[PDB]
């Protein structure tokens with residue numbers, strides 16, 4: 001398991017969906033900030 | 038969350054040297070780096086020294102790194118007594134020291150162990166007369182080593198603490214001497230423990246790879262100073278030069294580097310600049326014509342230098358052999374009168390002189406004879422002179438014996454011819470090929486065994502059917518009813534002689550070339566050094582005239598201090614550059630640029646959701 | 657001591673070097689009972705060479721004992737089969753040795769033809785060495801291809817020979 005989860009082939013695939021999740025949360029934070037403004 | 042858990046125990050009291058001792062005990066260097074070594078900490082005298090001692094005895098890398106980074110100077114720390122305490126500890130992981138002590142604890146005994154491990158005429162600094170009389174007790178600077186990193190390097194290698202060895206190598210002066218001495222000691226302890234071994238072979242391969250790289254950088258930066266580093270005589274490591282320590286550790290890669298081959302070629306040409314064969318043979322064959330060539334610069338003497346160029350000795354020491362193989366042939370294909378003719382007295386004599394030089398080389402006892410008999414050509418030479426000798430004293434009898442005399446000479450001429458090979462070895466193309474012929478022979482012997490088995494079987498069957506009544510006879514030994522089986526089982530023999538194994542031999546001498554071609558290219562570039570250091574030692578005169586030089590015996594790069602400091606700086610720039618360049622080549626690769634940005638991504642995501650809940654509360 | 661030795665005899669490397677010196681003896685005497693005259697009855701070295709084949713037979717069967725399943729497992733590999741043929745033909749020759757001349761000359765025949773196999777077994781003993789064994793196995797594998805190209809060369813050779821003759 002330690003030889004598996006240190007390889008590049010998982011370190012890319014998890015961080016891709018982490019990136020898209022943070023982008024959608026960022027735009028929801030954007031519309032909340034404009035409503036509070 | 039273990040750091041504040043340990044900080045609870047660090048906050049339990051205030052004895053800061055005991056706190057540093059406890060931090061060394063739990064073996065967590067980040068805690069001492071964060072909390073202990075801060076501004077305004079009080080320190081008594083002797084606490085840092087005892088802390089350094091307790092850190093060195095227990096295999097602590099980062100603690101010794103941080104204590105050296107915080108005031109501890111090794112030029113004021115280490116004395117002879119505390120180093121003796123380091124060699125007499127009891128906390129070692131795994132050591133083979135006491136076995137070497139019982140095979141050869143006082144430091145003079147340690148120096149005897151080191152001299153036994155390296156071998157040769159290596160005279161270590163512990164066994165000098167300047168260190169031995171100072172050891173009688175057990176200025177203020179009489180127990181301090183001026184170059185203490187060499188002793189720390191030796192203590193790191195001998196007790197097998199590898200990460201400490203790699204740490205101690207990269208500081209101080211004279212890194213390549215320490216690297217080659219480490220490679221020699223690792224290979225010696227590996228062979229001695231075989232006589233752990235895989236670990237020591239790996240460590241020898243490690244220092245060995247590292248030393249070669251520093252040369253690669255030191256050649257990649259400059260050349261004229263680069264040559265100086267290899268040549269200078271160390272005044273510390275037993276009067277050796279780095280190239281001799283490279284060959285004496287049998288490291289085939291260091292000599293294989295281009296700078297070593299260029300230095301050997303500049304040794305080979307000697308005192309000339311003509312960059313050869315027709316000119317150097319015309320120089321011998323026309324002795325007044327030598328003046329037209331171009332010398333170096335730092336008559337009546339312009340010549341004596343020419344005779345000492347080892348390429349000259351070579352072309353005037355192979356013209357003497359060409360003479361010997363032409364006269365010896367003419368003393369065999371011709372009539373032999375009752376006493377020996379002139380060319381026989383000359384051919385007998387050349388073997389005579391060759392014998393006295395060959396023994397004199399050994400003189401310059403059983404260890405010397407074993408080192409001389411380590412390789413094969415001296416052995417074959419010893420047999421050859423001996424049988425051109427039995428034949429020599431059998432020459433001087435009557436006919437029954439004389440005819441026998443022809444025998445030995447007849448059989449003895451094969452070896453001198455088959456030596457020519459060696460002379461042909463020098464050329465930059467025939468030498469690798471000759472080495473290959475040597476390696477292929479083993480396989481020739483094994484398939485000779487298999488072909489002998491099958492040949493003897495079919496021969497015994499064929500000869501046993503076709504001769505039924507043959508009483509026991511020595512005649513049978515000299516050779517050693519339904520005949521129609523004899524043709525068929527003859528033909529199948531050819532079907533398993535000239536079809537199956539010959540084509541097996543061709544298959545096994547075709548898929549073995551791709552490794553032996555890579556091996557021989559290394560072995561030739563290594564063994565040029567033995568040739569070049571061989572002929573400085575053989576006189577100028579030919580072997581049928583060497584009696585003058587032998588009876589005259591029977592009759593009865595040094596550098597200064599400022600260029601030395603330049604050398605120590607040239608090395609310093611290179612060592613730091615290698616580490617920096619290694620780090621810049623590491624941190625630019627993809628395999629770190631992905632792994633750091635993954636955890637950067639997850640950290641920003643968690644901070645983003647905390648910012649999200651804060652923004653909704655503020656809304 | 658007094659027993660320090662009996663262990664030595666049970667080390668299997670010992671059995672090996674005292675079970676291949678017995679074979680070296682067998683292939684030297686059998687050669688000397690073929691390249692020499694044969695008197696009307698068998699000589700001493702023939703009684704010893706006949707006997708070694710005799711004992712080898714009883715151990716080989718005893719190994720099988722220790723029924724058709726056992727014989728099939730024993731005949732799973734080839735060297736027992738080749739061994740079974742060899743003892744059998746050094747046998748037909750054994751009972752054809754004991755007749756008159758017309759037959760005696762025939763007797764020489766079988767022994768003459770039978771000596772090839774014992775020599776070609778040596779190979780196996782050579783198999784133990786850590787270099788000759790892989791090579792012997794290779795010789796065994798290459799043979800198939802030898803047989804196929806023997807077939808092709810036989811076709812072409814027979815054609816040109818029939819035309820020329």
Ligand SMILES: Cc1ncsc1COc1ccc2c(c1)N(C(=O)N[C@@]1(CO)CCCNC1)CCO2
Pocket residue numbers: 354355358391414459460461462463567568571
């Ligand atoms: C030299 C010498 N000694 C006695 S008679 C005589 C002259 O015969 C020649 C002529 C040309 C040569 C050599 C010998 N070679 C040679 O001597 N190689 C060494 C060095 O002695 C190194 C290791 C292999 N053997 C010894 C190699 C080929 O070039």
Ligand SMILES: Cc1ncsc1COc1ccc2c(c1)N(C(=O)N[C@@]1(CO)CCCNC1)CCO2
Pocket residue numbers: 675676679712735780781782783784
């Ligand atoms: C042993 C033995 N039996 C009857 S006469 C006799 C002594 O002859 C030798 C001498 C040296 C040997 C062998 C036999 N070998 C051998 O027996 N191999 C085995 C085991 O029996 C395994 C599979 C291949 N064949 C059988 C192989 C090579 O070493």
